[PDB]
Amino acid sequence: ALKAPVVVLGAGLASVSFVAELRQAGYQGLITVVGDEAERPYDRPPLSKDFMAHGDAEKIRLDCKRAPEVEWLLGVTAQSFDPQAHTVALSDGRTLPYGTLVLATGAAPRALPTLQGATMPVHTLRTLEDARRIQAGLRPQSRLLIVGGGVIGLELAATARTAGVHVSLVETQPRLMSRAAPATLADFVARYHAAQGVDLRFERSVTGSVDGVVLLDDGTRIAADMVVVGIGVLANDALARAAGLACDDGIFVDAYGRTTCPDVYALGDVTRQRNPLSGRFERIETWSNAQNQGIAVARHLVDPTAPGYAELPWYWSDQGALRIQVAGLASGDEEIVRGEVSLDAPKFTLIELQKGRIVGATCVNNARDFAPLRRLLAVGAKPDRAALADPATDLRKLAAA
Amino acid sequence: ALKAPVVVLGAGLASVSFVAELRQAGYQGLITVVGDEAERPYDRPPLSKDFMAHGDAEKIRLDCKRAPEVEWLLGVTAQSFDPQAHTVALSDGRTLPYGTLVLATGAAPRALPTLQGATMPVHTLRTLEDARRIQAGLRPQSRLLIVGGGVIGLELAATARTAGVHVSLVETQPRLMSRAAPATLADFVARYHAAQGVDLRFERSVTGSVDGVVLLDDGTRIAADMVVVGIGVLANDALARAAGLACDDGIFVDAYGRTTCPDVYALGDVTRQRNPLSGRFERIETWSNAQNQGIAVARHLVDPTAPGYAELPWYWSDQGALRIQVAGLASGDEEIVRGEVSLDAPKFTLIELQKGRIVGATCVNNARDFAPLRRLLAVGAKPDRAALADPATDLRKLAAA
Ligand SMILES: Cc1cc2nc3c(=O)[nH]c(=O)nc-3n(C[C@H](O)[C@H](O)[C@H](O)COP(=O)(O)OP(=O)(O)OC[C@H]3O[C@@H](n4cnc5c(N)ncnc54)[C@H](O)[C@@H]3O)c2cc1C
Numbered sequence: 001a002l003k004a005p006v007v008v009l010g011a012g013l014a015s016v017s018f019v020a021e022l023r024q025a026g027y028q029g030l031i032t033v034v035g036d037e038a039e040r041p042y043d044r045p046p047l048s049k050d051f052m053a054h055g056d057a058e059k060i061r062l063d064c065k066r067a068p069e070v071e072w073l074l075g076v077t078a079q080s081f082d083p084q085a086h087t088v089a090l091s092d093g094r095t096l097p098y099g100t101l102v103l104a105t106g107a108a109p110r111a112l113p114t115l116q117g118a119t120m121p122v123h124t125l126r127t128l129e130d131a132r133r134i135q136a137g138l139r140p141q142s143r144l145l146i147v148g149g150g151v152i153g154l155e156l157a158a159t160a161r162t163a164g165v166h167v168s169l170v171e172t173q174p175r176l177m178s179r180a181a182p183a184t185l186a187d188f189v190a191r192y193h194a195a196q197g198v199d200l201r202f203e204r205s206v207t208g209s210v211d212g213v214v215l216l217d218d219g220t221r222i223a224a225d226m227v228v229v230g231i232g233v234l235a236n237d238a239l240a241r242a243a244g245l246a247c248d249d250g251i252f253v254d255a256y257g258r259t260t261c262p263d264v265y266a267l268g269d270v271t272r273q274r275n276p277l278s279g280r281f282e283r284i285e286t287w288s289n290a291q292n293q294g295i296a297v298a299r300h301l302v303d304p305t306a307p308g309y310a311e312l313p314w315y316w317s318d319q320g321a322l323r324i325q326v327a328g329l330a331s332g333d334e335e336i337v338r339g340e341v342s343l344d345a346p347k348f349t350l351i352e353l354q355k356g357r358i359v360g361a362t363c364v365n366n367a368r369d370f371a372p373l374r375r376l377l378a379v380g381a382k383p384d385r386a387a388l389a390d391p392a393t394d395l396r397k398l399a400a401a
Numbered sequence: 402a403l404k405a406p407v408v409v410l411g412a413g414l415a416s417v418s419f420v421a422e423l424r425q426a427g428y429q430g431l432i433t434v435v436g437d438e439a440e441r442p443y444d445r446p447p448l449s450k451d452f453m454a455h456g457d458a459e460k461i462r463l464d465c466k467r468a469p470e471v472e473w474l475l476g477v478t479a480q481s482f483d484p485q486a487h488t489v490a491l492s493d494g495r496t497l498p499y500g501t502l503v504l505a506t507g508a509a510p511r512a513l514p515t516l517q518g519a520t521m522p523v524h525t526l527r528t529l530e531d532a533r534r535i536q537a538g539l540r541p542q543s544r545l546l547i548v549g550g551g552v553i554g555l556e557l558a559a560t561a562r563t564a565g566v567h568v569s570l571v572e573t574q575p576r577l578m579s580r581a582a583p584a585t586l587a588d589f590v591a592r593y594h595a596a597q598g599v600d601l602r603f604e605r606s607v608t609g610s611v612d613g614v615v616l617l618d619d620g621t622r623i624a625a626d627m628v629v630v631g632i633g634v635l636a637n638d639a640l641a642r643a644a645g646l647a648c649d650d651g652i653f654v655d656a657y658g659r660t661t662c663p664d665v666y667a668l669g670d671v672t673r674q675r676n677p678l679s680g681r682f683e684r685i686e687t688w689s690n691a692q693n694q695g696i697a698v699a700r701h702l703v704d705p706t707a708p709g710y711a712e713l714p715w716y717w718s719d720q721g722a723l724r725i726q727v728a729g730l731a732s733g734d735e736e737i738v739r740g741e742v743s744l745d746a747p748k749f750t751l752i753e754l755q756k757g758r759i760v761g762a763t764c765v766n767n768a769r770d771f772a773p774l775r776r777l778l779a780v781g782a783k784p785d786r787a788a789l790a791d792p793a794t795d796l797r798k799l800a801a802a
Pocket residue numbers: 009010011012013014015034035036037043044045046047048076077078079104105106107125126127152236239267268269270285286287288290314315316317318
């Protein structure tokens with residue numbers, strides 16, 4: 001159960017949601033949060049979206065007032081922990097004792113070795129600092145090269161195009177968002193960005209760079225004023241690895257957030273956990289997971305009577321005129337398409353089925369359907385394939401089941 | 402003497418210089434610094450200068466590595482202290498014990514009540530946050546109104562003009578930098594800014610504002626997209642006042658940084674101290690004072706054998722093409738002018754005399770002379786009035802004496 005004092009490593013969304021929930025649940029004991037970034041806790045989603053526009057960090061801070069009497073050690077790095085002695089060594093020379101240790105260290109952007117020593121600016125996008133630097137280079141008429149067709153790269157592509165920047169995007173895979181989205185969506189998104197002026201290149205890899213020019217594996221080249229690398233992230237599990245916990249690009253935890261080390265828990269982007277829909281363990285790198293997992297784990301720690309974490313995964317993406325919401329699995333037995341997939345008036349819904357059962361849903365500029373669909377997904381609904389296809393009200397079908 | 406542990410309130414230049422000096426001097430005990438700003442300690446001078454151009458805060462951070470093993474509580478506010486119990490109450494619910502308490506809380510910009518409720522943005526310039534907000538409004542062709550003809554307002558005037566902003570400056574006094582500079586300099590500076598396109602208005606006061614228009618006490622009005630108020634600062638001495646120390650818009654301290662409360666010291670912008678040149682007590686709001694006073698006080702705390710703080714005051718200002726350096730008093734018996742005071746090629750030196758004794762010096766785009774002049778000032782030199790006037794080498798005269 002809960003043993004005081006509580007020490008949380010990392011001051012991101014997972015950590016903030018966890019501590020707030022502890023207090024809300026009733027834990028009145030000591031809570032200390034260690035965050036290496038010298039910044040008032042903030043939200044990351046805005047960084048590749050609205051923030052690139054207003055540059056106002058005060059519009060993206062997280063609400064830490066819901067977590068009364070918590071000491072936040074900002075600008076401090078947890079260098080290591082001793083599971084035997086139950087202590088944490090900090091970069092400022094101090095040591096913190098703990099009853100319960102929570103690792104919410106997130107993940108960090110993977111680097112591109114071929115660009116080691118590029119004569120032009122090469123950035124990754126994870127922190128407020130990264131965002132400020134990138135935002136500064138988004139001048140009109142400049143040439144931006146984005147390596148990686150994931151949601152964050154595409155959101156930045158859309159943002160940059162709006163600022164009058166010329167954007168080129170290189171992806172090793174034959175499609176965009178190859179990991180997190182259904183093929184139908186990836187095809188439409190590619191078409192949308194192409195139509196926006198984005199120079200997309202699939203199945204191309206960066207091999208190197210010479211005098212301000214990026215070289216591709218197909219013997220061609222691309223001159224860029226700035227390069228932004230977004231080819232995925234790696235779990236910040238170094239402390240857990242050194243302390244002997246089970247890790248493989250992420251700390252393994254069960255539904256209670258427990259690691260293989262007693263009194264040590266983990267939450268957020270840094271964890272490999274069971275995907276309830278696929279039954280497999282994976283790292284779920286979403287905003288809702290960081291928040292929901294932090295809450296679920298805090299609740300069970302205060303009350304073992306509470307159930308383990310069981311929320312289904314979902315995320316959203318804002319890419320220019322596209323408001324994308326994706327829940328569950330990207331593929332299944334069959335796919336139902338509601339509405340029309342038109343570049344002109346994009347507004348459709350995709351439903352992924354697995355033997356009559358809803359296992360996934362995508363909504364593009366159709367938020368009204370997302371809520372019900374998530375409910376249907378939650379109960380493993382198996383609705384009428386026909387009713388599902390023809391313009392029925394999901395809110396209604398959802399209500400029934 | 403020095404009693405552990407040391408607790409410093411405020412994480413500005415004074416605090417950083419003090420703690421670094423403590424460690425350098427040999428104090429190996431505990432040191433805790435409390436700073437209400439959630440920012441890695443940074444320098445303020447760049448904010449109204451270069452920073453407005455590059456917006457890169459990483460180019461202005463202070464070096465805290467010279468102060469090993471210091472715990473920096475950033476984003477935390479010291480709410481009060483108990484000189485009896487020797488404790489400090491923090492905003493996060495924690496309490497810190499202290500052997501020696503140092504107040505380095507600086508000062509805060511004074512507000513303009515007549516602009517309370519202005520329909521347009523009204524900012525003051527003190528922090529990195531203020532700087533980022535102001536920098537965002539510096540768009541070309543916009544109209545900026547600056548209230549206050551002090552160095553910071555003038556530095557911002559120069560900066561804004563360079564960004565193609567239309568600048569209007571209102572000052573209640575008949576001259577610029579009325580407090581810190583010799584009249585000869587203030588006249589030249591006014592002429593320089595006027596020639597740069599700055600709309601200067603002297604002996605004018607702001608009486609109010611209506612629908613995006615600032616009203617002056619002379620029945621006239623000025624439409625402005627943004628207003629920046631820089632009419633001086635007030636010492637952040639609230640904690641000292643509440644604890645019973647002697648204060649009057651600043652904490653009174655002697656040459657050892659001692660306040661009237663045992664075991665409590667104060668440094669920087671927050672202190673009222675003796676001006677060695679005038680013999681009067683005043684608040685010295687300069688960069689060199691924050692650094693030099695912090696050092697002098699740390700030294701004497703570790704070694705009572707060391708002398709009290711005795712540096713003479715000086716500061717600089719970068720206003721467009723003008724590199725201004727001012728040391729000592731702004732006025733005296735007579736003034737010697739070396740070089741030519743031309744708007745075209747500004748490069749002159751002013752020497753303030755008091756019965757044959759050098760009591761002040763101003764250098765405009767003449768840094769070579771500043772060093773020697775400061776040395777002459779340090780020894781209270783009384784050189785030849787003629788030699789001083791005619792092109793002699795100050796380095797040389799300085800060497801002699
Ligand atoms: C630009 C961007 C846009 C995104 N947009 C979306 C979106 O639209 N929708 C969505 O669902 N998700 C989005 N995400 C993902 C979402 O931001 C993450 O899932 C979420 O931030 C993960 O939270 P976290 O608390 O686990 O970890 P993080 O936010 O990474 O925070 C972990 C913190 O711990 C710190 N830390 C690491 N090691 C140490 C140590 N040893 N000592 C002290 N501190 C340490 C880290 O530096 C960091 O500040 C986006 C992410 C980025 C970067």
